[PDB]
Amino acid sequence: FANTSTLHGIRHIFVYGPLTIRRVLWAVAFVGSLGLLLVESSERVSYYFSYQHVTKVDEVVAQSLVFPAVTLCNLNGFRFSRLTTNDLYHAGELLALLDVNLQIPDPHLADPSVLEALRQKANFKHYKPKQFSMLEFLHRVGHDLKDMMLYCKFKGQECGHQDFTTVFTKYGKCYMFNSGEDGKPLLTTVKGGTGNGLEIMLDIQQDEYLPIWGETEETTFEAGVKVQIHSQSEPPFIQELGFGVAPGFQTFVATQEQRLTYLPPPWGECRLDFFPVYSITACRIDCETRYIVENCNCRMVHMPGDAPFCTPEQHKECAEPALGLLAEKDSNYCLCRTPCNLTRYNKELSMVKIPSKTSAKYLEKKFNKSEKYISENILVLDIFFEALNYETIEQKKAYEVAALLGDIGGQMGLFIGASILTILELFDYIYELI
Amino acid sequence: IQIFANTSTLHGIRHIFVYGPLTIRRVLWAVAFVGSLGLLLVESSERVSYYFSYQHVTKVDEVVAQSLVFPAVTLCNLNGFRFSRLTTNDLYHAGELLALLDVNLQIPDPHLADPSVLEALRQKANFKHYKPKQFSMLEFLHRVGHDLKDMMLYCKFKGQECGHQDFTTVFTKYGKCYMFNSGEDGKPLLTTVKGGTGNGLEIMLDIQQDEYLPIWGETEETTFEAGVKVQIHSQSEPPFIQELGFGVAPGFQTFVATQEQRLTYLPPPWGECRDFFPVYSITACRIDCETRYIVENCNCRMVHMPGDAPFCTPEQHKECAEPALGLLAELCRTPCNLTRYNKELSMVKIPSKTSAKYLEKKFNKSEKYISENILVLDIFFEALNYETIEQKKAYEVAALLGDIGGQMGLFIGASILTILELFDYIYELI
Amino acid sequence: IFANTSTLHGIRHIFVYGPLTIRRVLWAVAFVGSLGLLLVESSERVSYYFSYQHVTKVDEVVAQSLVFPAVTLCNLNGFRFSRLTTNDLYHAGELLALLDVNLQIPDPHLADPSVLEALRQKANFKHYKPKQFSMLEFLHRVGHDLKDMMLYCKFKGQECGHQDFTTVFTKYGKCYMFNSGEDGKPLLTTVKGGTGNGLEIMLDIQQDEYLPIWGETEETTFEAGVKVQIHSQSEPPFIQELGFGVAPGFQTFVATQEQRLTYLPPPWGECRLDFFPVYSITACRIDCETRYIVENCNCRMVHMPGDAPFCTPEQHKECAEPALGLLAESNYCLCRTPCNLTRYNKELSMVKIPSKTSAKYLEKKFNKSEKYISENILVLDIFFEALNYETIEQKKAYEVAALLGDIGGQMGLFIGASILTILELFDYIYELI
């Protein structure tokens, strides 16, 4: 009888009278309903714990964008003219100007003019060496922006090498525009188009490039600059993320601000010894640095730390094969996950010829250079925003707990009419039968 | 006086054994219910809070098509005025503008000029006893601006021949430009039906680099560059090549592999989408905006602007409208439907060795000229499909109900009516 | 034997049945009202469910290695002039546009002197007995040779060779595909970003083997370089359409990202082959071309698969070329997206080759003029910008379990009804009859 009596209950049961009946279908109809509720409620919980996301892509008109950092590097790291005898001593083998015995490799195939200058400076049989510092070396021999930069406009106003910042990188002594160093307030763009961005004309000084001759294992046949457009929060990794600019063209880099937002685990993979602010580039440098200061007790020039600078002795026989080993052989010493908030810059590249006929003469005059030189050494580079807007890409949580309840809640309502309390009511009644 | 005690409402739909007459260890129900009620209020708030946050999410498809509508291609020589075709009257008014003449109407630094250039400017600039004649910046530009008839050596579309009669004059901050497949004259828009370089627009251009205005001596100008600018753009939008154009260089076949993008944005409260032009565009408004500010503060309009205003004379251009724009830059939101075109650029060299001679012959031009003046330009669809990017409303009212509905079901077993039932019963107690 | 008044056992929410009529008939409206909305809103939800929407899930994933794609590359020139034989000029002569319909040099007075000399040497058919000719054997022999064309190949810093590429015929002629996977060895992988650790090849395009053009030809073949498709090893190259140009006199950098698209079948999306085991849009579009030509032309072209017979230049001209011309204009061919697939997104940048200080080295090493080097040599770097793939998935918007939870909660809200509540009522109406 008690069962008959518990049918003031909230779950839905005509399965308890005094006499057995016609209506045993309710037994099935209820067991049926209960079945589905359990099937479908599982799915919803299963899915909830799958901790999915979905993507929200907007594009937002803006009154101004913050102009990014532009790092740029000559493909040539060391000017030939500026190599000293002391330099050719330590760095000689490194720059591939000298064989292991400190002597000019295949003298008969060398440029006459090159061999003249190397014979003058590389007589090491009797040489008493002097102290040498890879950083001091690079600072002195690396291409000079003062020399390289023929003009600089930003938003149509004049600029100069005083708006750039020396920044060492696997390419040597490089220059970063709008770096923000010394907390100077970052430059901003206020109009789209080629006109109102960064515009620089460069002489890449192609006749200071290290010479290549004879039976060399070298393939450094290329001339121009590498360039990374990158947010001021992240260091340049121009090694990998650079794009080429070629001489004899005005290259247009039309850019858009991208504002990524990622979710932490368990939805996504969101979330440093040497850098205050975290970056993928930042970690991957910090990682490189830590593994070399460990296995080589020096650091390279582009790395941070207070460690001692890797001598060309070390660079050759230690640190270069150490990186050779880091990538291909040894799983990441540090694998580096995405930051949560971050800003990317999307580039479209187009080009027009420089110089035109009607300017060729002017340029030859102004700069005291041959028609040839201008046409194999000069480029113009425009970085600029296509229009005043950023794109937002956010990862949004797919199914939060409140929505799970509303779904299991409505599913219960549909099949049984049950609440939490309905179940409690039943458990109370079974605990009373014991 | 004759109404049910609380005890008596066990007819009530909420889930309550809190009204047996004498007190019991089962005060937990009071907790369990107040507990359940608490969460219901917490969780139902969240859902309403969220609803009114009027979020969206994004739906990205890519759709195979039997045919795409081919876009509008506007193209401009980097040079706005051919030197050969400058007249003495032109050099009079426009002289200072083109930076061929100082504030007085004479050649700035004749000693540094090309010999041949100075000869030709002396021939045409004798102004001490010249009585000026009528001058019109539009008529000027129409006449001196590069001619497509001259510039265009061949035109294919879908492999079939084309001509300057498939293009339309269009003035822009670059001068007299030309727009392919413009749709003007209500002619039915060209369509592509096969991918690849072959079956798009293909044009060979001579940019006439030796008609470029010369620059010499102690000039502040830096127009050192040669080639064309190009905007690929939907026929409903005007070109804004000043900002959105991409460069093409001479001495290369430049390939522009394109995809149709079909953006759909939501109005407020979810997203931010919503007179001189029939159709609204961001470019359209930004022109309308520039025009209104210049016709106000300068009583003229420039050549590329619309309106019925009077064309800005070089007098005005110098002293008024140029610094007016200098002042202007120093809120136009997205249309709801719109079509974008995504470009990938690649290049090959022109001319090849085995055709260099042929081209020199056919066009009566130097080996040098061909190599510093000729380009080929292919605009074409990579394959027959458009990408759709739609903003979809995140949480509609029907789904809010289903969630607050099921939350009530879960914690209380309440309906709307359940609450009404309770309010009826309290109104009866008063 | 149950009373309307007496169904107070009923689960939907009803104060509407006493014995006498009352001021509280509002319940009748409030209920009919509630029932109204329930029907309005529950329709919307079902309507929407059957609208079978989706939404998009975009992640980006760090990886310790990416699989390097397939690179197919083609010289713009399909046939080296030097290597054209007398037999070849006989059958293929008209095809290569070297000879008019009467097997004679078209406008000899406008021809390059040196060209005409070499065509006269090879195209005097006065006494010639023709021999067996095969467009495939022809193309295999005359088409540019990678051995010749490829001056060096690096991958991940280590050396490479023509034996890491695979001959692959295409609308452009005899082309070469890197990391094709055909050798049943495991596909090559990148483990560091940047220019250095991708494919890097230096090519001499042999611009002076290009077929010459002279006199009154209707032509656009003025251009020199290579076309290149970066593509999934699962898909054949369709370089005719999907290729990008590389120009001589530049190191061209192709920075790529792996994209991993997932699409939904009907009814949500348009997801999901005689001649190809693996399905591709490219794959079916070839299979489609092939089927239509073997039907309407009884041959196949060289790039097509099948067991059909190869189209002779006779056939190629007068049959199969206009047959494809007729496929254009407007598709007799429906080729939908695969479900899983991998795309490669390319950014192109360039620097000059050669530098001044290497120009002479290259001239010497390769025994070539300053001019030749500068109009024939290019370097091509394909590589991943950084170790990650982008995932774009189409995700079902509203599955059946979520429809129930919504119709369920809507019923709960307006009526307090379950499935059983309605059954309960139908039982009670079947009992009234």
Swiss-Prot record, chain C:
GO terms for biological process: cellular response to acidic pH; cellular response to xenobiotic stimulus; detection of mechanical stimulus involved in sensory perception; establishment of localization in cell; negative regulation of apoptotic process; phototransduction; positive regulation of synapse assembly; protein localization to synapse. Inhibited by the diuretic drug amiloride. Inhibited by gadolinium ions, the heterotrimer with ASIC3 being more sensitive. Heterotrimer composed of ASIC1 and ASIC2 are inhibited by the snake venom mambalgin-1. Glycans are attached at residues 340, 367. Keywords: Cell membrane, Disulfide bond, Glycoprotein, Ion channel, Ion transport, Membrane, Phosphoprotein, Sodium, Sodium channel, Sodium transport, Transmembrane, Transmembrane helix, Transport. It holds the Pfam family ASC. The chain crosses the membrane at residues 25-46, 400-414. One of its GO terms (cellular component) is neuronal cell body. The keyword Disulfide bond applies. Disulfide bonds join 74-175, 271-339, 284-335, 288-333, 297-319, 299-311. Expressed in brain, cerebellum, trigeminal sensory ganglia and also detected in testis. The gene is ASIC2. This is Acid-sensing ion channel 2. Residues 47-399 are extracellular. One of its GO terms (molecular function) is ligand-gated sodium channel activity. A motif (GAS motif) lies at residues 416-418. Can form homotrimers. Heterotrimer; forms functional heterotrimers producing channel with different properties. Forms heterotrimers with ASIC1; while ASIC1 determines current amplitude, ASIC2 influences the properties of the current. Forms heterotrimers with ASIC3; resulting in channels with distinct properties. Interacts with STOM; STOM regulates the gating of ASIC2-containing channels. Interacts with PICK1; promotes ASIC3 phosphorylation by PKC and activation of ASIC2/ASIC3 heterotrimers.
